[PDB]
Amino acid sequence: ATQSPGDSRRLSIQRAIQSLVHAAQCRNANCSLPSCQKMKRVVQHTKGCKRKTNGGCPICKQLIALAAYHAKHCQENKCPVPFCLNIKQK
Amino acid sequence: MEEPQSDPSVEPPLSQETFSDLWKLLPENNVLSPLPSQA
16 A cells, blocks of 8 residues: 555666666667667766766756665666766776 | 745656656667677
């Protein structure tokens, strides 16, 4: 009964995570999940820009934070995830 | 406070809450510039 926007927000990132984590782990390139290709487009673009990788873009700013929550819960340095390496490896 | 009540925390989920920003806030036609075997 707790379900609420707060849960919708958690579900919002879960779906983004499902693609971010998957798209950032499944570097197939031909991924059959439109969400992945579009996320790669986002990740592939995220790095393409150095200013953006610094949080310049709301996409990076928000993604870095989203990454912060995931990279935190994940006590293991996944490896393919750029940010995790930047936070956990550094 | 105007009447709707706190909006910063009460954001009507459209299903693309995050997605929205992901591909629509792209600084410019995404860059695929591949990086040399870095990993």
